[PDB]
Design a protein around this ligand. Structure first.
Ligand code: APR
Length: 267
């Protein structure tokens, strides 16, 4: 990988992952011997379950394998239903106190956050249900990857559908990223976060797989760059960002373009 500090993100340290040893070169969700606590952000489903395909399926696989090792009987069906029930409950609570962080075989503690009520500032029919909601979970020791205490936090976010018009998509995407950064920043100011502070985020290109439909990866990369810059302005460059490997390099390209633009802003 390569790590650089980006001025367009207020000096934030960003780690861009290259291809891994694994099939398809995908970046692992968690490392065996991390020297800091990095929370990986699940590209969640609108229905709020952990399961399915893509990145969400890898979160499911990771939790299930660890449960199996510890003799915990937990099927993919049980994990999907349970995670959905928990996150549905958090969404209900979060929508009743919007803009506030609200607070099991797998979860020790769970948090929810919506920057704004979904569907209130955009069309649900255009971007999709529950867009912008973010959850933070502390994992129980028994399902923590590698039994390492620095791997005990995950996040879960719902991205907008790429089919949406550009104006509403940009708004929805900026809001989603604000929810990710905001939820983590708020988490670190809770009692739970004092004990287990998040020191980095490991990010996919949110909305960039099955959700993007006909939308170009480059437009999403631009949305991510703008959203990330604004979110860091709002909440501060508290922790480092890591972008998981993407052969399109969409997130990288967006930030490169933003960085060069930032250099020229006073000329
Ligand atoms: N097995 C994997 N391991 C690591 N990274 C992956 C994997 N599969 C996909 N990715 C990367 O994660 C990024 C996120 O893509 P998606 O997971 O498709 O996210 P999104 O398109 O927003 O939709 C997610 C949807 O897929 C389902 O798994 C889940 O139920 C959710 O509804 C993609 O850019 C892709 O490169």
């Amino acid at each position: 990988s390569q790590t650089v500090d980006l001025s367009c993100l207020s000096g934030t340290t960003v780690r861009f992952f290259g291809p891994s040893h694994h099939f398809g070169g995908f970046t692992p969700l968690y490392d065996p011997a991390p020297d800091k606590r990095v929370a990986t952000v699940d590209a969640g489903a609108n229905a709020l379950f952990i399961g399915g395909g893509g990145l969400n399926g890898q979160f499911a696989k990771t939790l299930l394998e660890e449960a199996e090792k510890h003799g915990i009987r937990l099927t993919p069906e049980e994990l999907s239903q349970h995670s959905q029930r928990i996150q549905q409950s958090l969404l209900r609570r979060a929508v009743k106190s919007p803009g506030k962080l609200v607070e099991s075989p797998v979860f020790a503690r769970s948090f929810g956050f919506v920057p704004v009520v979904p569907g209130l500032m955009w069309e649900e029919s255009e971007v999709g249900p529950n867009v912008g909601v973010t959850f933070v979970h502390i994992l129980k020791p028994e399902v923590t990857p590698y039994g390492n205490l620095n791997n005990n936090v995950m996040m879960y976010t719902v991205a907008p559908s790429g089919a949406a018009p550009d104006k509403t998509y940009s708004l929805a995407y900026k809001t989603t990223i604000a929810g990710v950064i905001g939820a983590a920043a708020a988490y670190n100011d809770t009692p739970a976060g004092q004990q287990y502070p998040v020191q980095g985020l490991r990010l996919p290109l949110l909305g960039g797989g099955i959700f993007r439909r006909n939308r170009s990866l480059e437009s999403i990369g631009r949305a991510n760059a703008e959203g990330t810059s604004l979110a860091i302005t709002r909440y501060g460059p508290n922790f480092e960002l890591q972008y998981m490997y993407d052969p399109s390099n969409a997130a990288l390209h967006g930030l490169q373009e933003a960085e060069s633009t930032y250099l020229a802003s006073a000329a």
